[PDB]
Design goal:
Chains A, B: Pathway: Antibiotic biosynthesis. Chains A, B: It catalyses: 3-phenylpyruvate + S-adenosyl-L-methionine = (3S)-2-oxo-3-phenylbutanoate + S-adenosyl-L-homocysteine + H(+). Chains A, B: One of its GO terms (molecular function) is methyltransferase activity. Chains A, B: Keywords: Antibiotic biosynthesis, Methyltransferase, S-adenosyl-L-methionine, Transferase. Two copies of one chain form a homodimer. Chain A is of the alpha/beta class and about 325 residues long. Chain A has two domains: about 1-100, Winged helix-like DNA-binding domain superfamily/Winged helix DNA-binding domain (Arc Repressor Mutant, subunit A, Orthogonal Bundle); about 155-330, 3-Layer(aba) Sandwich (Rossmann fold), CATH 3.40.50. Chain A is built from 14 helices and ten strands. The first copy, chain A, has helices at about 1-30, 30-35, 40-50, 55-65, 80-85, 90-100, 100-105, 105-110, 125-150, 165-175, 185-200, 245-255, 285-290, 300-305; strands at about 40, 70, 75-80, 155-160, 180-185, 205-210, 230-235, 260-270, 315-320, 325-330. In chain A, the strands form two sheets. A seven-stranded mixed β-sheet of chain A has the order 6-5-4-7-8-10-9, covered by helices on one side. A three-stranded antiparallel β-sheet of chain A has the order 1-3-2. The longest helix of chain A is centred in the first third of the chain and has 27 residues, at about 1-30. The interface between A and B is large, with 78 and 79 residues. Bound molecules: 3-(4-hydroxy-phenyl)pyruvic acid (2 copies), (2R)-2-hydroxy-3-(4-hydroxyphenyl)propanoic acid (2 copies), calcium ion (CA) (9 copies) and fe (iii) ion (2 copies). One fe (iii) ion (FE) binds near residues 238, 239, 290 and 295 of chain B.
């Protein structure tokens, strides 16, 4: 009936603002406060954080509009969907705060004659803020299970796409005096990681180099690569694709890190045959987004069928619970 | 249950993409082809509009993910929620294509520390694009009803926030002997109005001037102002507020258009006391967006209470269906 349609459309409209508020509420500290305390006071929160209170009221209202919170007086309370939304909060951030400009510009991005040069913008800073927690909450457990079953003690580890440095820091903690090499394409990340490494006492163990897995052989730290016996690479596998570029990069990595014994490669992958009305969280946004950026996403099976050609043998594999279909390969 | 919360949060995620896809689908022709024919061929559609098909498949998938269309092989077919979504497409467009940058930047915008200068940004062309259908779809019935019941035939009409100039062209169509007079703030919104009026052939009838109602005493082509016997102002009244400013701006219009007989004033207002889970479409976005923008938004009762002090007398009032709580006042 028409009343059902009004309601469902209104919900779509309001989910939009709830969606954008989920990641905002996270960044601003609201969700955390709500998880500990079950309850908060809007004004008191606004004063403490020094936020424009009429906008704060809207934020929670947006969240309340779809049952993530409940409002009673000037009090906001966790609602029936608080845990699900909060569990997945960094995905909403990725979607909105990170990638909001891409989806906004849909009528501009879809036309073929616009799809040349740099044809879309995203907030690089926002993306790395969400990708941090995305790595931690979704990929880490499997990353550690892979490390748990290496069958040897690494002496030198390289991490492709090292971001903030935290993965190499945790590795140094696991294996006290291991050396670390982080490869990152971004100068901001490098400086940040050098600072954070230094901050935690590892300046002497962990160093960073500017670069891309895809041109890893042109990198001037190349002579340090012979020492590396563990290789890691999370959340950028798909950017090695198309398939023939992937084969090339994998071979380049094989040759440049000849003494690597295990290479842990983690990423999300493209799903097949999920029906339109049962699509889980993230999946459509991840997939639709990369199609909008004209970036191909392999499936699990496509990864499976590229390793040997790329010069690697896959010896273990771990599914992620649950971020579309995501996986950690162990290669050798 | 845990399964229900999973499904709900996924729908909130997917509704974000669907929401954005509604305004995109409209701008790109898909909603119109769908409403005409009930179905379309995604490949043909992609070909006809020269669009990147995989991203087009993404848009229709977003829209299907929440019941707006159904995908059937290569065909997209209207869904149960289509009539309602299509009806409000310009509201979704406003939220996303128009105002997406505001809501995206929620964590940068809410902190008082960053609320100086030009601290948010929206897509002015996208906004005016939607606002043309908002006007025509939600305000026109009332607007023409008001005009049908004036008790006089206007000789010269002044439209504040003339936008495209389309309001004035219709007036001209209706009253061939009439003198149009657009007053917009944008020197280049004038331009595409002037050349467009001209291009359709109303150039001796409708002329245009830069100006802002709020500072209407300071305008530089007042030649025609004493001749204006009908004044219109749509979708911008709330910009006159807070109250004292509104009193002043109303007085200033009174003194500047001293032979105006009726002043038609149309706007959306702030609702009161609607339960968080029964919010209808648009309301939260209008209200939350303006709070985020630092823009005062009056209730129906606040408007009611201000006109006499503003030097006007409210003789008629029209409810709109249903753009939240929207109204058209007739003042003399
Ligand atoms: O932003 C992009 O292009 C990404 O691909 C980020 C990404 C990669 C893998 C994930 O599991 C989640 C996010
Ligand atoms: O974008 C804004 O600030 C608006 O105020 C637009 C607007 C104003 C009134 C309406 O009834 C619908 C949209
Ligand atoms: O083909 C695959 O399944 C993966 O690429 C990695 C893999 C392959 C074979 C195994 O026995 C375990 C893991
Ligand atoms: O006070 C109001 O409701 C409005 O200002 C307009 C109005 C006021 C009195 C009337 O008799 C009819 C309309
Ligand atoms: Ca409290
Ligand atoms: Ca509950
Ligand atoms: Ca951006
Ligand atoms: Ca396989
Ligand atoms: Ca067809
Ligand atoms: Ca913008
Ligand atoms: Ca006439
Ligand atoms: Ca006052
Ligand atoms: Ca409704
Ligand atoms: Fe990517
Ligand atoms: Fe406004």
């Amino acid at each position: 009936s028409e009343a059902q349609a009004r309601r469902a459309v209104a919900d779509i409209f309001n989910s939009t603002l709830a969606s954008s508020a989920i990641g905002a509420a996270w960044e601003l500290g609201a969700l955390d406060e709500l998880r500990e305390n079950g309850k908060l006071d809007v004004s008191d929160f606004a004063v403490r954080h020094d936020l424009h209170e009429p906008a704060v009221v809207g934020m929670f209202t947006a969240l309340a509009s779809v049952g993530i919170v409940r409002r009673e007086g000037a009090t906001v309370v966790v609602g029936p969907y608080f845990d699900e939304a909060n569990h997945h909060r960094s995905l909403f951030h990725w979607l909105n705060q990170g990638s909001g400009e891409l989806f906004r510009r849909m009528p501009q991005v879809l036309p073929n004659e616009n799809r040349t040069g740099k044809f879309y913008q995203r907030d690089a800073g926002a993306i790395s803020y969400a990708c941090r927690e995305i790595s931690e909450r979704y990929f880490d457990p499997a990353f550690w299970a892979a490390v748990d079953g290496l069958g040897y003690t690494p002496t030198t580890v390289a991490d492709l796409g090292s971001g903030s440095g935290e993965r190499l820091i945790q590795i140094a903690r696991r294996f006290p005096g291991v050396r670390g090499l982080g490869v990152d394409i971004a100068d901001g990340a490098i400086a940040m990681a050098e600072k954070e490494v230094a901050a935690k006492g590892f300046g002497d163990q962990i160093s960073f180099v500017r670069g891309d897995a895809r041109t890893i052989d042109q990198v001037s730290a190349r002579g340090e690569f012979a020492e590396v016996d563990l290789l890691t690479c999370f959340m950028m596998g798909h950017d090695f694709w198309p398939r023939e570029n992937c084969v090339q990069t994998l071979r380049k990595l094989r040759a440049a890190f000849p003494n690597v014994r295990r290479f842990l490669l983690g990423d999300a992958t493209r799903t097949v045959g999920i029906p339109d009305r049962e699509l889980p969280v993230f999946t459509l946004g991840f997939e639709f987004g990369h199609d909008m950026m004209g970036v191909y996403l392999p499936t699990l099976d496509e990864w499976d069928g590229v390793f040997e050609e790329g010069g690697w043998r896959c010896v273990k594999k771990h599914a992620i619970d649950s971020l579309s279909v995501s996986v950690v390969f162990e290669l050798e």
